[PDB]
Design an enzyme around this catalytic site. Structure first.
Site, PDB file in Angstrom:
ATOM      1  N   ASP A  92       0.725  -1.129  -0.184  1.00 32.03           N
ATOM      2  CA  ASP A  92       0.192   0.036   0.010  1.00 32.03           C
ATOM      3  C   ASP A  92       1.133   1.429  -0.562  1.00 32.03           C
ATOM      4  O   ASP A  92       2.187   1.194  -0.471  1.00 32.03           O
ATOM      5  CB  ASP A  92      -0.883  -0.248   1.429  1.00 32.03           C
ATOM      6  CG  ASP A  92      -0.766  -0.240   2.281  1.00 32.03           C
ATOM      7  OD1 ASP A  92       0.670   0.358   3.247  1.00 32.03           O
ATOM      8  OD2 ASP A  92      -1.321  -0.910   3.416  1.00 32.03           O
ATOM      9  N   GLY A  95      -0.089   6.012   3.005  1.00 28.51           N
ATOM     10  CA  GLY A  95      -1.107   7.245   3.432  1.00 28.51           C
ATOM     11  C   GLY A  95      -1.851   7.038   4.515  1.00 28.51           C
ATOM     12  O   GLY A  95      -2.585   7.393   5.339  1.00 28.51           O
ATOM     13  N   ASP A 270      -7.810  -8.287   0.245  1.00 29.40           N
ATOM     14  CA  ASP A 270      -6.727  -7.908   1.018  1.00 29.40           C
ATOM     15  C   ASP A 270      -7.677  -7.484   2.482  1.00 29.40           C
ATOM     16  O   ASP A 270      -8.970  -6.448   2.189  1.00 29.40           O
ATOM     17  CB  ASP A 270      -5.505  -6.819   1.160  1.00 29.40           C
ATOM     18  CG  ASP A 270      -5.978  -5.553   1.632  1.00 29.40           C
ATOM     19  OD1 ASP A 270      -6.411  -4.827   0.709  1.00 29.40           O
ATOM     20  OD2 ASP A 270      -6.230  -4.812   2.826  1.00 29.40           O
ATOM     21  N   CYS A 308     -13.049 -27.444   6.071  1.00 28.60           N
ATOM     22  CA  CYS A 308     -11.961 -26.982   5.972  1.00 28.60           C
ATOM     23  C   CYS A 308     -10.807 -27.787   5.826  1.00 28.60           C
ATOM     24  O   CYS A 308     -10.685 -28.958   5.912  1.00 28.60           O
ATOM     25  CB  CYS A 308     -12.108 -26.281   6.704  1.00 28.60           C
ATOM     26  SG  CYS A 308      -9.843 -25.664   6.465  1.00 28.60           S
ATOM     27  N   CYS A 310      -7.468 -27.924   5.704  1.00 27.36           N
ATOM     28  CA  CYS A 310      -6.365 -26.473   6.619  1.00 27.36           C
ATOM     29  C   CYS A 310      -5.500 -27.596   7.463  1.00 27.36           C
ATOM     30  O   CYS A 310      -6.140 -28.792   7.910  1.00 27.36           O
ATOM     31  CB  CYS A 310      -6.470 -25.611   6.668  1.00 27.36           C
ATOM     32  SG  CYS A 310      -7.183 -25.230   8.261  1.00 27.36           S
ATOM     33  N   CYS A 313      -7.971 -27.800  10.625  1.00 30.12           N
ATOM     34  CA  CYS A 313      -8.965 -28.928  10.796  1.00 30.12           C
ATOM     35  C   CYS A 313      -8.553 -30.573  10.458  1.00 30.12           C
ATOM     36  O   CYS A 313      -9.603 -31.171  11.075  1.00 30.12           O
ATOM     37  CB  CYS A 313      -9.741 -28.466   9.704  1.00 30.12           C
ATOM     38  SG  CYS A 313     -10.513 -26.881  10.286  1.00 30.12           S
ATOM     39  N   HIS A 339      -5.711 -21.246  10.018  1.00 34.53           N
ATOM     40  CA  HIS A 339      -7.183 -22.399   9.586  1.00 34.53           C
ATOM     41  C   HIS A 339      -7.427 -20.594   8.619  1.00 34.53           C
ATOM     42  O   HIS A 339      -8.720 -20.961   7.601  1.00 34.53           O
ATOM     43  CB  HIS A 339      -8.154 -22.479  10.543  1.00 34.53           C
ATOM     44  CG  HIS A 339      -9.593 -22.471  10.104  1.00 34.53           C
ATOM     45  ND1 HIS A 339     -10.063 -23.130   8.976  1.00 34.53           N
ATOM     46  CD2 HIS A 339     -10.010 -21.471  10.602  1.00 34.53           C
ATOM     47  CE1 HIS A 339     -11.124 -22.932   9.176  1.00 34.53           C
ATOM     48  NE2 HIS A 339     -11.323 -22.070   9.974  1.00 34.53           N
TER      49      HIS A 339
HETATM   50  N1  LIG Z   1     -10.252   0.515   2.553  1.00 36.29           N
HETATM   51  C1  LIG Z   1      -9.034   1.107   2.504  1.00 36.29           C
HETATM   52  C2  LIG Z   1      -7.694   0.590   2.742  1.00 36.29           C
HETATM   53  C3  LIG Z   1      -6.965   1.393   2.645  1.00 36.29           C
HETATM   54  C4  LIG Z   1      -6.816   2.148   0.881  1.00 36.29           C
HETATM   55  C5  LIG Z   1      -5.804   2.960   0.838  1.00 36.29           C
HETATM   56  O1  LIG Z   1      -4.751   2.787   0.944  1.00 36.29           O
HETATM   57  N2  LIG Z   1      -5.932   3.443   0.186  1.00 36.29           N
HETATM   58  N3  LIG Z   1      -6.909   4.233  -0.397  1.00 36.29           N
HETATM   59  C6  LIG Z   1      -7.841   4.048   0.221  1.00 36.29           C
HETATM   60  O2  LIG Z   1      -8.969   4.652   0.140  1.00 36.29           O
HETATM   61  C7  LIG Z   1      -8.156   2.995   1.168  1.00 36.29           C
HETATM   62  C8  LIG Z   1      -9.087   2.267   1.768  1.00 36.29           C
HETATM   63 ZN   LIG Z   2      -9.369 -25.497   8.813  1.00 38.66          ZN
END
Ligand SMILES: Nc1ccc2c(=O)[nH][nH]c(=O)c2c1
Ligand SMILES: [Zn+2]
Ligand SMILES: Nc1ccc2c(=O)[nH][nH]c(=O)c2c1
Ligand SMILES: [Zn+2]
Lengths: 372, 372
Positions: A92, A95, A270, A308, A310, A313, A339
């Site tokens: 990322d 910021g 993510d 699952c 994994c 489990c 898990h």
């Molecule tokens: N939920 C999120 C999580 C991370 C980010 C980001 O890193 N930049 N800009 C974003 O709008 C943003 C929203």
């Molecule tokens: Zn599992």
């Protein structure tokens, strides 16, 4: 492999399934990226992260620029070498976590000045510095430096933030392109802003496409608007981004949010939910999440989830993990996280396969019936 | 395999090397047993513990009788099944940790009554209850319930404690023998007491041999007397125990303490030093221990130890582990513990091989020259 190549193998409605080929590896989409905060995916060795099915992980830039330092990591050989993950890493811009975790932030058109919530030090994170830090880390997928707009946001404030983000996207692009090694080995994703406003989202998408990026993230969501609102925004926002490039929904990870987002055209996710286990005790199952700390699991010999596959489990019971978590044991955190991330990867696999087989809509329906 | 069979393959001075065969596996001696506190070896999956070279682990009884409960563990299938370790498990009696960690302990000839340092509950740990708890846990090597004498101890107090311990050893033996399943599948070790006094140690050894046990532990040491004193006591204490049975030095684990103890006839060791890492940052190396948190390791790309063959030293640098520990990351604890226990197992291997090859004395000399 090429620097970057996204190819869509199958479709169903707005949903897509395919692959992103990069020098360090192939990313199957829709993809879920486990989060590595301080150069580590909480309580998991990189080999364990890979074992769960992850093709790529997200590296937090904010934490890294402070703690060991971007320059230090570069001197040590880069983040991949440093943490032991040789596959793709999306970083990322730093910021977002600066605004959320740092002290006395001062914003301007040049960037953001702030104080570390650790040693109380100072930094001036700008589009150029952010791109440089991600380069020093040896990032495969670089995120443009933007300004996430707080929710709720008035039209004028959302417009001002989005416009600034678009100017910063242009600076991020140029900074990325001027560094030959980075432009040739890594990818750059732009981030759409505009809050919940359609006209602003459209202006953002157009500015981003005009600049041109390898991928497009939908920013400004998962910030307190709720699922119904998030879905409504994605409804009109995703179709505005170039169809032939990946669509990344930042910070979205609840299982149902992911399924709904894929139905709306998202290819990448993510979230910290999987890794942020080990404490409260939340474990995901196909029958909805459960809190392993609950007394009803003290003598439950069954695995966290009945189907699952994994390693957790296969080997340990709910009773054992219940005990570990309540005892505050490290192994409890290790087991819960493995898990949880494994469960997410299995969810992404089921999504990828159902799309490839033209039965994703049915999968989403069956998933919700059981999960809720 | 048999219930229990100790065979000495090689000797050099007082040192011995061999194997203990039990139903659940073979234990190579001299052996180091990693400590599983709350049904877990701190920050390590059982497969990782085995990967380091461990043939057996020690299970703390005190913590187990409180937290999940001995009866509960029995209902769940036993400790082996519960934690996922299918090899031998030596369990302590729980008395030592009752005196060290519990509240308002009341002692008597019947046993010890105390309050949990957790929920503030109550228990009456006696020789019979201790043996029963170890049975419920499914222990392979059961320790007789005794009374560790505090250091320093006056002759009369050391005599009174030792005599009581011998009476409790007889009760432990009988309790063990009356439970058919336990007597046929597990082993029972007696514990020598008598502080630093030779005549008392002799009386203890004679009482223990008269009762008859599968192994003999040297108790009452590693309680503040120092290495010189500990070695002096072992000098005359170990030869008093039956030569054809294993000699177990409880709570002794510093690398040099182990080498010196093996030179004095000890076959078994256990210690929390390896597992109690993850915080202060102490890592064992052949050049002495180091504290990874020290700033001099921030950019050190070399492994924890230059010759250690553990997975940690193969994959990660001192710089990375330094970062993880200072950041308070769980992976730092996982990595430090795996290396530390691996280092100990490698030390035991070097000890076993040097004895088998008649060059242990030379190994001890070379080990100290480098370590110090
Ligand atoms: N939920 C999120 C999580 C991370 C980010 C980001 O890193 N930049 N800009 C974003 O709008 C943003 C929203
Ligand atoms: Zn599992
Ligand atoms: N150092 C130690 C550690 C543990 C024990 C014990 O469990 N019993 N008896 C002991 O004397 C003893 C000494
Ligand atoms: Zn090592």
């Amino acid at each position: 492999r090429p620097r970057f190549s996204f190819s869509i193998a199958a479709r169903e409605g707005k949903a897509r399934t395919g692959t992103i080929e990069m020098k360090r590896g192939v990313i199957r989409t829709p993809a879920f990226m486990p989060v590595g905060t301080a150069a580590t995916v909480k309580a998991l060795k990189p080999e364990t992260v890979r074992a769960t099915g992850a093709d790529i992980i997200l590296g937090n830039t904010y934490h890294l620029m402070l703690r060991p330092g971007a320059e230090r990591i570069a001197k040590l050989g880069g983040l991949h070498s440093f943490m032991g993950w040789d596959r793709p890493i999306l970083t990322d811009s730093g910021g977002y976590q600066v605004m959320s975790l740092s002290s006395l932030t001062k914003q301007s058109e040049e960037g953001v000045t702030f104080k570390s919530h650790l040693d109380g030090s100072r930094h001036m994170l700008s589009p150029e510095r952010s791109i440089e830090i991600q380069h020093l880390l040896g990032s495969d997928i670089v995120m443009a430096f933007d300004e996430c707009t707080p929710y709720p946001a008035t039209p004028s404030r959302a417009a001002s933030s989005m416009e600034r983000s678009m100017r910063w996207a242009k600076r991020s692009r140029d900074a990325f392109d001027s560094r030959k090694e980075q432009a040739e080995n890594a990818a750059l994703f732009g981030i759409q802003q505009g809050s919940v406003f359609e006209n602003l989202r459209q202006q953002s998408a157009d500015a981003l496409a005009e600049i041109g990026f390898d991928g497009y993230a939908v920013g400004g969501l998962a910030v307190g608007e709720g699922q119904d609102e998030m879905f409504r925004v994605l409804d009109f926002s995703v179709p505005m981004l170039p169809d032939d490039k990946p669509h990344y929904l930042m910070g979205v990870g609840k299982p149902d949010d992911i399924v709904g987002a894929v139905e709306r055209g998202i290819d990448m996710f993510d979230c910290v939910l999987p890794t942020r286990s080990g404490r409260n005790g939340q474990a995901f199952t196909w029958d909805g999440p459960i809190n392993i700390r609950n007394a009803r699991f003290s003598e439950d010999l069954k695995p966290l989830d009945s189907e699952c596959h994994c390693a957790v489990c296969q080997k340990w019971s709910r009773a054992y993990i219940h005990h570990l978590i309540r005892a505050g044991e490290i192994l409890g955190a290790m087991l819960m996280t493995e898990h949880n991330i494994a469960f997410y990867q299995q969810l992404m696999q089921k999504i990828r396969d159902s799309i490839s087989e033209g039965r994703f809509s049915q999968f989403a329906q069956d998933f919700r019936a059981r999960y809720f």
